[PDB]
C-alpha cells in the first residue's frame, strides 16, 4: 500500500513481521490555538529503502532553473506542520502509534 506518507516517510517491506497498535489521543496533543511542534516532510525526489531515517531538509528542486536555497517560484518548503484542533471530525485526531 502506497500514499502520501507510506512511500515517503516510513515504508514497510513485503517480508515484514511484527505488529502495529494505535489508540485515541485527542485530549493530549490538541490545542485550540494549534500545535506546531510536529513536522513532516512532503516533497522528495523518489522513494527510499525501508528502515532508514532522513534528517536533511534541503530545498526541493522541481524545475529546470535552480533555486539555490531561495524560497521563490517553482520551489517550496517541503516541511509542513500538523494543524490540529479540538473541533474536528472522527478522522482528524492525533493518534500516537508505535510499531
Amino acid at each position: 500500500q502506497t500514499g502520501n506518507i507510506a512511500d515517503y516517510n516510513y515504508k514497510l517491506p513485503d517480508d515484514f513481521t511484527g505488529c502495529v497498535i494505535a489508540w485515541n489521543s485527542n485530549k493530549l496533543d490538541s490545542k485550540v490555538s494549534g500545535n506546531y511542534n510536529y513536522l513532516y516532510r512532503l516533497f522528495r525526489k523518489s522513494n527510499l529503502k525501508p528502515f532508514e531515517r532522513d534528517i536533511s531538509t534541503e530545498i526541493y528542486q522541481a524545475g529546470n532553473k535552480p533555486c539555490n536555497g531561495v524560497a521563490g517560484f517553482n520551489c517550496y518548503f517541503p516541511l509542513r506542520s500538523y494543524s490540529f484542533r479540538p473541533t474536528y471530525g472522527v478522522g482528524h485526531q492525533p493518534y500516537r502509534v508505535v510499531v
Partner: antibody
Amino acid sequence: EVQLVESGGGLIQPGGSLRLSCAASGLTVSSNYMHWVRQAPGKGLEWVSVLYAGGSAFYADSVKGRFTISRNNSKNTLYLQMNSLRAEDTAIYYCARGLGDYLDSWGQGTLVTVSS
Amino acid sequence: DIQMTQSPSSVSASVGDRVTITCRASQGIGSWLAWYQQKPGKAPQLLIYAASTLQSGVPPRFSGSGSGTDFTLTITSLQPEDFASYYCQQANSVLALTFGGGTKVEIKR
C-alpha cells in the same frame, strides 16, 4: 513564464486507443505531482488520476483503472493510454499539477469526445 | 460516499451589494480550504492556498474561513468580473477528492 498546452484530442470511436501529450514549460515532470480533472457538460469538475514519485498510482473508485501513466524525462512530457471507452467519457480534459493536496496551475484544455 | 452539498444553488446580486456562498461537508475536515472560480470558455483559476492567506495574483477583497464542517466565502467589494461558478475543495488527506455542484451569480442589467 509558466504555461501548459495540450494536444492530441479529437473525435474517436469507442474502444479505440489515443495517446495524450502534456508538456510543462520550465517544470520537470518527474518531480512535481500531477492531476487530471474531467468536466462533463452540465457537471462539475471530477478528478481522474494522480501521479506519485514512481511505481504507484491511484485512480477513481468508479473506474476500474483503465489509465496507465508513463512519463519520460528526456523531453519533459506526459503520456497516457486510453482503453475501454464509455459514452460518459465525452468531456473536456484539464492538464493539472498538484502540491500539498492543492492545485495551482491548469492547462487550457483539450477536447476528447466518444461517439458510440 | 462523501456526500457534499452546496447551498444555495443560484443567487443574483448587483454591483456593490451583499452576497455570500456557503459550502457544507458531511464529515469533519480540518482547517484546510480552497475556492475555485469557473468562468465558462476558460480554465478555472486558483483563489486561495491556505485557510486564510490569499494568492499573489488575486485581489485581497475575498474573505472566507472556517474550523468545523461548515465553510463560507464572501466578497467585500463586488466587481463585474467576479460573476462565475464557485467551487469548494477543502481536503481529503489521501487524494484530495471533494467537489460540489456549485453556484452561479449573474450580472445585474
